[PDB]
A paper describes a structure:
The hypothetical protein ORF6 of the [name] phage is conserved among all Nazgul-like phages and consists of a single domain, currently annotated as a domain of an unknown function DUF2815. Here, we present structural and functional characterization of the [name] ORF6 that allows us to establish its function as a [name] (SSB) and extend this annotation to other DUF2815 family members. The SSBs are ubiquitous within all kingdoms of life and in DNA viruses, and protect [name] intermediates during replication, repair and recombination. In this study, we show that the [name] ORF6 is structurally homologous to the gene 2.5 protein from bacteriophage T7, and present a high-resolution structure of ORF6 in complex with [name], which reveals for the first time the structural basis for the [name]-binding mechanism of T7-type SSBs.
Author numbering: 1 to 177
DNA sequence: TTTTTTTT
């Protein structure tokens, strides 16, 4: 549920007082919302999505994400955390994925969660069956998503990752396949 | 309220 209290609203996004961030009107790729992904090779399976944020239209919400990344580093429970820019949930499509046409001119956000996120159709109805979830949110559609940064400091390294809380269908478009 | 991701 969006039972959150806005702190700051910008074009294509909202920062909430709880530290959650809504990233609005972004293109979806590689959804794993019907069934969790990963944990073939040691890790535990998680639901996930990639969000493609156009650089020309989403600069304000990008700035909020950066600010919140810094805040998350500073507030890490064991003390302020140093994290490399390659170890964040946000990547630069033009640098990191130059051979992927769908990433051209995009910020690329990866968000994951062990608990299945809320999945809403355009009528804001919450979906429950894996098949209906897979049909609704297909790679290439546009969504709005609630995420929240978190700080990782463990045996595998130091990262700022993003919890995936909700995915709302916004627009249909050509599927990536 | 919690915790490795990764392009896949
Ligand atoms: Na459910």
């Amino acid at each position: 549920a969006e039972k959150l209290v806005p702190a700051k609203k910008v074009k294509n996004g909202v920062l909430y007082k709880s530290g959650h961030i809504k990233v609005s009107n972004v293109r979806c790729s590689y959804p794993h919302l019907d069934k969790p992904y990963g944990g073939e090779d040691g890790g535990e399976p998680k639901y996930s999505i990639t969000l493609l944020m156009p650089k020309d239209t989403h600069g304000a919400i990008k700035k909020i994400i950066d600010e919140q990344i810094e805040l998350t580093k500073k507030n890490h429970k064991t003390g302020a955390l140093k994290v490399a820019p390659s170890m964040l949930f946000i990547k630069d499509g033009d640098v990191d994925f130059p051979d992927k046409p769908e990433c051209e001119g995009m910020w690329v956000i990866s968000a994951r969660e062990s608990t299945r996120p809320d999945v809403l159709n355009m009528e804001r109805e919450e979906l429950e069956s894996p098949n209906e979830i897979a049909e609704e949110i297909y790679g290439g559609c546009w969504v709005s998503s609630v995420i929240r940064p978190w700080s990782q400091e463990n045996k595998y390294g130091k990262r700022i990752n993003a919890n995936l809380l909700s995915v709302l269908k916004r627009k249909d478009d050509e599927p990536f396949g």
